[PDB]
């Protein structure tokens, strides 16, 4: 109880935050019908470092930052080899949200649906195109991209895994 949380908020230049949806989810009780706020926060620096997080609380801002503290303990790093794009195409479903990611030329800003585009514009990739096949959901969507960019391999570690010395690569 020292006060004002100035040093303790950690001013968040390192991780920039945004919501991607704040739906009010509600439960009914004996007394009636009371609601809490479920916010989904995607945290990440533009270095290649993102992760989702849900939260719910009766306040809006405590749900956002509570989802952020859930989010900033959930980070993967993005395998993004070239001039801020992707090594190869990928698809990976989670639940019932399927996400096709596809690398792009460098003259192409990120084009995807709002959750996928949110976790990629926070991922610092600049050149991708990801269609979403399946759900209208936002959480399983974004988390499906996170699973869809964990399982993604560069050329250096595939060259290391196969044992092949090196060729067949322009750069």
């Amino acid at each position: 109880g020292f006060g004002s949380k100035s040093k303790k908020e950690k001013i968040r230049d390192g991780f920039e935050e945004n919501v991607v949806q704040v739906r009010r989810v509600t439960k009914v009780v004996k007394g009636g019908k009371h609601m809490r706020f479920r916010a989904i926060v995607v945290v990440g620096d533009k270095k290649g470092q993102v992760g989702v997080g849900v939260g719910k609380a009766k306040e809006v801002v405590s749900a956002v930052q509570k989802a952020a503290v859930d989010a900033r303990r959930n980070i993967i790093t993005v395998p993004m080899t070239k001039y801020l794009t992707f090594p190869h195409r990928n698809e990976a479903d989670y639940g019932a949200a399927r996400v096709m990611l596809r690398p792009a030329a460098p003259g192409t800003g990120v084009i995807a649906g709002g959750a996928v585009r949110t976790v990629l514009e926070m991922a610092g990739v600049e050149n991708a195109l990801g269609k979403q096949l399946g759900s209208n959901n936002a959480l399983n969507n974004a988390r499906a991209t996170i699973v869809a960019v964990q399982t993604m391999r560069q050329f250096s570690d595939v060259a290391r895994d196969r044992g092949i010395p090196m060729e067949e690569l322009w750069k």
């Binding site: 030329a105 003259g107 192409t108 800003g109 600049e126 050149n127």
Partner: protein, 199 residues
């Protein structure tokens, strides 16, 4: 059209449109209300990169669709090539050479047929220049020294590396297509390119 309109509105909204319509910074006696408070949808952000581009060059938006279709149609970084097809626009060059203070100034300065290019007159502001061109005045403009007034008040900013201004014989030429670093305006190519993906 031209849009020909109130323009500090567009500077307060879009941020400072550099060079175009002012060297004077906005709101010398203004802005003392209207808290943004931080709510701006992302479509508003990409839209403000459209109009940050569209007002800074004075284009019709249908003509900007035309330049995006040519920019996709060419080979390479479409976020950059859009800012090559809108830098070697003629009145942008006459702005950049300081032949006029503002880009409506250069557009009107080329509407009233005051520019010879390679010795031939070009009456149209949307003319796209080439490498190794020649940009001069009119023969009456040594008697009509309006260009010399603009070159008098101009030379705070010098030139980017395509231009070569000759002092009294008033000739400016571009060595090669302008580089991205060379582009004067500061904006994200990806934001604008992404916006037109929908078409």
């Amino acid at each position: 059209s031209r849009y020909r309109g109130p323009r500090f509105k567009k500077i307060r909204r879009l941020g400072a449109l550099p060079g175009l319509t002012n060297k004077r910074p906005r709101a010398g006696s203004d802005l003392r209300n209207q808290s943004r408070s931080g709510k701006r949808s992302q479509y508003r952000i990409r839209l403000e990169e459209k109009q940050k581009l569209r007002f800074h060059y004075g284009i019709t938006e249908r003509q900007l669709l035309k330049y995006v279709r040519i920019a996709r149609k060419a080979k390479g970084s479409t976020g950059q090539v859009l800012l090559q097809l809108l830098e070697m626009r003629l009145d942008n060059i006459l702005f950049r050479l300081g032949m006029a203070p503002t880009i409506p100034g250069a557009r009107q300065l080329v509407n009233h047929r005051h520019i010879l290019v390679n010795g031939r007159i070009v009456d149209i502001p949307s003319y796209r220049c080439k490498p190794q061109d020649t940009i001069m005045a009119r023969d009456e403009q040594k008697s009509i020294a309006l260009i010399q007034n603009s070159l008098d008040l101009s030379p705070r900013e010098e030139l980017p590396k395509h231009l070569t201004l000759n002092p009294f014989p008033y000739k400016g030429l571009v060595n090669q297509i302008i580089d991205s670093k060379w582009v004067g305006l500061k904006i994200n190519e990806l934001l604008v390119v992404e916006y037109y993906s929908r078409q």
